[PDB]
């Protein structure tokens, strides 16, 4: 690849909330926290993911228990 024309591309780590850590080469430069990946996305998994902190559904349950 031509030298000095491409953005700095280096290996980084992406940690999903579920705790799945993936080693991906990328241009971000800083380690990045992730809220959802292919492993825990409901459509890919085929099952509703465990409610993660911050989600509107999660907030509704913590503040009030429906039963």
């Amino acid at each position: 690849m031509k030298k000095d024309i491409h953005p700095k591309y280096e290996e980084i780590t992406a940690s999903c909330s579920c705790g799945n850590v993936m080693k991906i080469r990328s241009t971000v430069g800083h380690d990045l926290n992730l809220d959802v990946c292919s492993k825990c996305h409901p459509f890919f998994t085929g099952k509703q993911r465990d409610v993660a902190t911050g989600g509107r559904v999660d907030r509704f349950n913590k503040r009030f228990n429906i039963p």
């Binding site: 591309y9 993936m22 991906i24």
Partner: protein, 178 residues
């Protein structure tokens, strides 16, 4: 890289039994991934295309090629040779790393994601999809983006038909609508 090793280690065996290919050189393989942004508003502002190019460079890691109008078109007020687009061809390790990053991180990020279409195969096994918001990629920070844009992703394969193209992408757990 990790996704390339998966293709040789797992995908070739699955396809060879499924389609009964006699030669390992007959299994479909991914050639290139082309990222395209049509900045048709570049006519009003040159900077808008530069910003799009910067976004494409952040998303893939390669300087984008600024595509120009093939012919003057009076309908869109474009004249032959005007820079109105950006494109990036990904091959090799960089292709396999973009593919991995896409399915693993960006695809599970589109709001109201019901699955990618499975009829978008072009008849020759080359898949094409269109991201309507670029903020799905982790390199695109929403704070410093001038305007939200979109990108066309084309995955060109050596597959002979649509069955063989769907199978190769399916073997990589591509999220088809099913």
């Amino acid at each position: 890289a990790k996704l390339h090793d998966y293709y040789k280690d797992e995908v070739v065996k699955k396809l060879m039994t499924e389609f009964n290919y006699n030669s390992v050189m007959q299994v479909p393989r991914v050639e290139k991934i082309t990222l395209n942004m049509g900045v048709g508003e570049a006519i009003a502002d040159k900077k808008l295309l530069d910003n799009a190019a910067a976004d494409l460079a952040a998303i893939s890691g390669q300087k984008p090629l600024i595509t120009k109008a093939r012919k003057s078109v009076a309908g869109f007020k474009i004249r032959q040779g005007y820079p109105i687009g950006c494109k990036v061809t990904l091959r090799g390790e960089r292709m396999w790393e973009f593919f991995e990053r896409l399915i693993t991180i960006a695809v599970p990020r589109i709001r109201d994601f019901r699955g990618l279409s499975a009829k978008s195969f072009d008849g020759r096994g080359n898949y094409s999809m269109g991201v309507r918001e670029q903020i799905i990629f982790p390199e695109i920070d929403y704070d410093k983006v001038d305007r939200v844009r979109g990108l066309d992703i084309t995955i060109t394969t050596t597959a002979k038909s649509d069955e063989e193209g769907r199978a190769l992408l399916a073997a990589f757990d591509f999220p088809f609508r099913k």
